[PDB]
Amino acid sequence: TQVLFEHPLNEKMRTWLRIEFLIQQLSINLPIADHAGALHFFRNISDLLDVFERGEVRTELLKELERQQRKLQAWVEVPGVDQDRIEALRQQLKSAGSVLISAPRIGQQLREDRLIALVRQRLSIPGGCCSFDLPTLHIWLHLQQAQRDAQIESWLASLNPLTQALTLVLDLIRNSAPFRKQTSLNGFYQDNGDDADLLRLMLTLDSQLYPQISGHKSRFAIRFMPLDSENGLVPERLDFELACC
Amino acid sequence: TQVLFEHPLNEKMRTWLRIEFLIQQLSINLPIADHAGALHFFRNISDLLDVFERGEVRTELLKELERQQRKLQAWVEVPGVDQDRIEALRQQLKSAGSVLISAPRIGQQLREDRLIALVRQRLSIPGGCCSFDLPTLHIWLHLQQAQRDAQIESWLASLNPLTQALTLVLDLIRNSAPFRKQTSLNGFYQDNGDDADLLRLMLTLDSQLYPQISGHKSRFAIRFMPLDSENGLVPERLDFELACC
């Protein structure tokens, strides 16, 4: 019955959410045995390289990892807390930091890759791929699965530093704040998110509504819209769950 | 061991080959249960609508269907031929013609669709989709599978007139000409394709080569390239299969 919507409260978080999604898509389609899986894969790599242009990802991740290490050392002197958890999270953060800092430039390996670049040029064209548009991709798919699997794995491994860091920080952020019940009157709602990075919002599918979140800096505004824009009525009162992370 | 490459000898055939591929991709991913399958689906619809701008698809298909009906009535007075096949193919062509001619404007239904248009706007953006970029798509995926399946089926049904016609003509074209053995000396080859619409070219994967087909009108030229552009050697003689359709 429940539906989770997340919203970034800054441009950094918007970037990070996109990267998360794209990297999840790359892990979900192995093994790659046809054009469908292949085009899907390369589209997501191409989009990922384009998302990287929105900010300095490595830089912001190195800062956030340490910041999370700082936000962890407040929880040290708190009875009831597992100190093995704290030390383990600290160690994960530290390792992610030094892996990330030592790693090559983010996805330079992916840009330089001849097969990736080749496919990347053709995605712009509407009927982008076919044996006649992409012969190199066509022959690649006639190889044995293990030759592709190995090529795929080295591509994904070069993203591991980023993946490890991002998985870490977003998980910590997502668990940094609890959900709280709120009410919208006549489909409208607004508040200062403070300097939270992420909104997390739960509705029911039985409401047959969806949120459209506006805002300028942090002061967010929500309009709860129906799916059917003729038949759909907005309730005069709606309760929902909200966490500001 | 064998690898089939096809090449269009005109802009019409290039269009048609792309449409074929895209429509195959739309049929291969049902049922749609997540963002991966959904984005894949909508990307292919969006690309299909863009391919339609390359020519008058309905028009060219109506002509080709009749032309195929004409090319069939030569085979009528040929002993050894099944006359049930001929009459059945004729009847399939005729039906495809009148279905296509009676159908609405090709994929106008798809352009007008609110959900398609909505998603279409967001594909331009690098990290195109997430619950925050596409809330309407997010809620759509929380529905029960049958609500999506029904929506998908009506979308695919509106393409049936095109699909039926195109499947027909391309199959007939592909079988209009037999494969013949040819030889390339030092990775090069050239000939007049006449006014053939399609080249069909078979190589072996063990050759570890691929064709790059040039040309101006019909006079085609082929360079057989290695995959590895340093280690790769081109044989002084290469035999391959070729059909001009």
Curated annotation (Swiss-Prot), chains A, B:
GO biological process, one term: FtsZ-dependent cytokinesis
Pfam families the UniProt entry points to: ZapD
One CC-aspect GO term: cytoplasm
Keywords: Cell cycle, Cell division, Cytoplasm, Septation
Compartments in which it is found: Cytoplasm
Disulfide pairings: none
InterPro entries: ZapD, ZapD_C, ZapD_sf
Record-stated family: Belongs to the ZapD family.
Subunit structure: Interacts with FtsZ.
Function: Cell division factor that enhances FtsZ-ring assembly. Directly interacts with FtsZ and promotes bundling of FtsZ protofilaments, with a reduction in FtsZ GTPase activity.
HAMAP family per the UniProt record, alphabetical: ZapD
Official protein name in the record: Cell division protein ZapD
This protein's encoding gene: zapD
